[PDB]
Ligand binder design. Structure first.
Ligand code: HEC
Ligand code: HEC
Ligand code: HEC
Ligand code: HEC
Length: 107
């Protein structure tokens, strides 16, 4: 796989800007985040050709909002998903990882 960027990449969602650091995610299998596509390893931007590059839907596989939060049972493992289990480790962090605001996601 490509060389993991030691720098965080901005994820200009709908309006608010959120940057995700890889360092803090250098112990989590890529797949874990970079799910497979048609059983074909890929690493295209969250919003790559025929992917999640439409925040005008709000709900749908063509949305980068229902695959970012969705802390429910999804095909893969959403962010808020994992973070969910994490909170089960540092109950005193139920926000920094799962915070709508005043967090490391929504400052
Ligand atoms: C990282 C740990 C996040 C936490 C915690 C929360 N959100 Fe978030 N949010 C995140 C990203 C990376 C983005 C960019 C675009 C996307 O949808 O992934 C967002 C964006 C939003 C948006 C804008 C999208 C839209 O539908 O207009 C909203 C409204 C939003 N986030 C709300 C929200 C709430 C209510 C949260 C607490 C449950 C929350 N976010 C947590 C990443 C992260
Ligand atoms: C979630 C905890 C992740 C893990 C684990 C890894 N990466 Fe990642 N990567 C993540 C996000 C949220 C993004 C961009 C978000 C967006 O909306 O664009 C990325 C982006 C990359 C990129 C750039 C293009 C792309 O594939 O999106 C590369 C080259 C990349 N990531 C590499 C990479 C590798 C090699 C990983 C395993 C060692 C890896 N990432 C894990 C989130 C996450
Ligand atoms: C195009 C090559 C894609 C890119 C880039 C990413 N994903 Fe994706 N994802 C893609 C498809 C075609 C589908 C449909 C699922 C199916 O049943 O075939 C998905 C699905 C997801 C899901 C599950 C859907 C849900 O219930 O919300 C999640 C959680 C998801 N994708 C996350 C995700 C993230 C975070 C990405 C960037 C880091 C990402 N995908 C890139 C195709 C593509
Ligand atoms: C488990 C499989 C995870 C998934 C999926 C995602 N993240 Fe995560 N995140 C995880 C851990 C264990 C931690 C703690 C940091 C550590 O030392 O391991 C985090 C932290 C973050 C942070 C804060 C970074 C910090 O300095 O504490 C952010 C902003 C964050 N995570 C964002 C994020 C996004 C946007 C994800 C989906 C694209 C995502 N995480 C997935 C574990 C996991």
């Amino acid at each position: 796989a490509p060389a993991v960027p030691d720098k965080p990449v901005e994820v200009k969602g709908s309006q608010k800007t959120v940057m995700f650091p890889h360092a803090p995610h250098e112990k989590v299998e890529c797949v874990t985040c970079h799910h497979l596509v048609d059983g074909k390893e890929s690493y295209a931007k969250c919003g790559s050709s025929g992917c999640h590059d439409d925040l005008t839907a709000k709900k749908g596989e063509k949305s980068l909002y229902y695959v970012v939060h969705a802390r429910g049972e999804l095909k893969h493992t959403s962010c808020l998903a994992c973070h969910s289990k994490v909170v089960a480790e540092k109950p005193e962090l139920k926000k920094d990882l799962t915070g709508c605001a005043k967090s490391k996601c929504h400052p």
